[PDB]
């Protein structure tokens, strides 16, 4: 309180206790004391309100007050799994760095020679040193 060396110590209470799990040895070495760590541990903090299941599809949460992330069912995407899967690319090149051409509710991007693919298909991983179109970032 009202000290430069004390603001960094109290900053670990709202992070290594609220976002993840708490512990007794967390605020002992940081505070460099023993009188305030014991008082903070005596007050338990239930995390969180996941017993009533705020999300659908019987999803569970984690040890976090407020924010949470559930494993919703497939076919539904978005924040609370609302938007369906993407059907066609057409516009915005389908979020892929090559040709976008729909095949009746089926889009797949792939580079030709001189380039390969990634693990999912977001962008073609460069392989050759200088094929027919690159940029030199050496300088």
């Amino acid at each position: 309180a009202n000290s430069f060396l004390e603001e960094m110590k109290k900053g670990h209470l709202e992070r290594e206790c609220m976002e993840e799990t708490c512990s007794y040895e967390e605020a002992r070495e940081v505070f460099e004391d023993s009188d305030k760590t014991n008082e903070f541990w005596n007050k338990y903090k239930d995390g969180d309100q996941c017993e009533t299941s705020p999300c659908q599809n019987q999803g569970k949460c984690k040890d976090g007050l407020g924010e949470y992330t559930c494993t919703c069912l497939e076919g539904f995407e978005g924040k609370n799994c609302e938007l369906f899967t993407r059907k066609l690319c057409s516009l915005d090149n389908g979020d892929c760095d090559q040709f976008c051409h729909e095949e009746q509710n089926s889009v797949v991007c792939s580079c030709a020679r001189g380039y390969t693919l990634a693990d999912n298909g977001k962008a073609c991983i460069p392989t050759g040193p200088y094929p027919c179109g690159k940029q030199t970032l050496e300088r």
Binding site: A1, N2, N80, E82, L83, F84, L91, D92
Partner: protein, 641 residues
Amino acid sequence: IAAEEISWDYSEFVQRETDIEDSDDIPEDTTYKKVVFRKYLDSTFTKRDPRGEYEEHLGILGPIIRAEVDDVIQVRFKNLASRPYSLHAHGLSYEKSSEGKTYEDDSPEWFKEDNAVQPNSSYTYVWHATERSGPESPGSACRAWAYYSAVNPEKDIHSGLIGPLLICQKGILHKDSNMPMDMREFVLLFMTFDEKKSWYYEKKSRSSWRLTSSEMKKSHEFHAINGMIYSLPGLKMYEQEWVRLHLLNIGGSQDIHVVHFHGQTLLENGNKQHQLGVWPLLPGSFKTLEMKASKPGWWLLNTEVGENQRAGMQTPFLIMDRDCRMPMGLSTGIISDSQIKASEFLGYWEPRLARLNNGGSYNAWSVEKLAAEFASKPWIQVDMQKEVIITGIQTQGAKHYLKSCYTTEFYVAYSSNQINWQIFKGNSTRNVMYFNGNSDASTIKENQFDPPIVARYIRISPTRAYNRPTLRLELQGCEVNGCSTPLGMENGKIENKQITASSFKKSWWGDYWEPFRARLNAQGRVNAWQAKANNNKQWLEIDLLKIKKITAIITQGCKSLSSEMYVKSYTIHYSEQGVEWKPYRLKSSMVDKIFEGNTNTKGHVKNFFNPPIISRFIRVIPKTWNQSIALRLELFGCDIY
């Protein structure tokens, strides 16, 4: 998007929104069998979008979608009644996959399937956002569109199945749920709605159907303005605002109006070379242009017509003050929260004793013990029995040794009729389901409001603090007319040449007093004006240069770091362009008014005055007094044109 059949009332002026007369009996039925839209955050029901404070212009119309570049919002629809509904957009060169018009097509059940929605069955449908609606040329940045049904070009626009497609540009966005705002745009849809010309026509009328309603000619076809009649809310802006106004007219093809504002010149953007002044409307296009206000007051909003004013629209828009940051109930001693209502309190400390930095370890708000506080209902009805306008409320905790003790989160509510509690303040423009709060104890925290919220039954409710629920909410309102602004009697704009003192006290073998600092919260020697004599002869003249309209006043008093003196009564002398030291006339009779000075020591005096004080050389002569002459005179005038 939904479309549940809900009977909407066209003749809404009986609700007494801004109406004056009371003998307005409806011959037929007030409500009409129509359909209203609704916005859902999910694909299923049981989850509606709360209409925020900014979502005002709608009436019978549902929500307004805001989709821009790289931002698409789904529009899942499910029929609830027994008739298949449709939805057709306008603007871009959209294909039949997102069109929805009943004509020739190609796909079996996809190009025209949205026009035939089976009851109790959802359907996958989503529109596409383009870049055509973006107004080119340096000037504007928004241009709205329109969308409605398609099962009938005429039986749908009267069935309450309308909707504007407000689309702006890309480049300027705000943090209001990732929606591009950073302004204060408005949209109005002026189009009459008919009950006899709709799909939900119940074969008969609510009174007569011989010669198109024998009571009134086309009584079912009322000129409903923005879904209602004699309403038009949210027209509460401030002085000099270049806000954008969207004028949309698609159905009214044989109704040409010319908008003319009472004392507001126009300015066209884009070319930056036109002034215009007036601007009519053409059927089809979506005209949009700025407003640029000038003088405050209840300026009438009309279209210079005889059939759509006294029987259509007649709502004057109000312009309130911009710099109305004067003390309301903290620095004064008259206006206080004595009329506070609640149910559950927070501890044992004193209720009203909640001033900023006060002596003692008991300074908060409570009457009954708190026991346990959580997400219950510790509502605090902050009623004022009058009109209110709040743009910012501060929040400060309490401490006396080391503890913080601060409220981390609290939800706000409001009401306008006491019988119902419209708990919807937490979902305003930026807020959706939360609100700011205090952080520490020695640092003052404020909560500024964006929308000009107006009500009468304000309600706040805390949640849980640092093991000690203690709140000290202040009060900060604003004017109603929009002209009562401080001319600088306490800030510094009014120099000493205008407000002059009387005698100057000077000791023989010592120093000398400087009683020319007659302002609010002054330091140094004295704090205001303290004359040498102590009778009913001293004066305190003020030069107002021009004529002003004074309504509110304030007066504290000074001291000498030992004893506190003040004035108990004074008289205001009004004049004109010349000179006339005559007291202010009493409008309730014919005599002069007897004003009262400072009541206690430091509690200010707040009083309203309806009759204007048209003068320039206002003189104040203190009659009675307390110990010695002392007062921090400061008034609130206007700019009478």
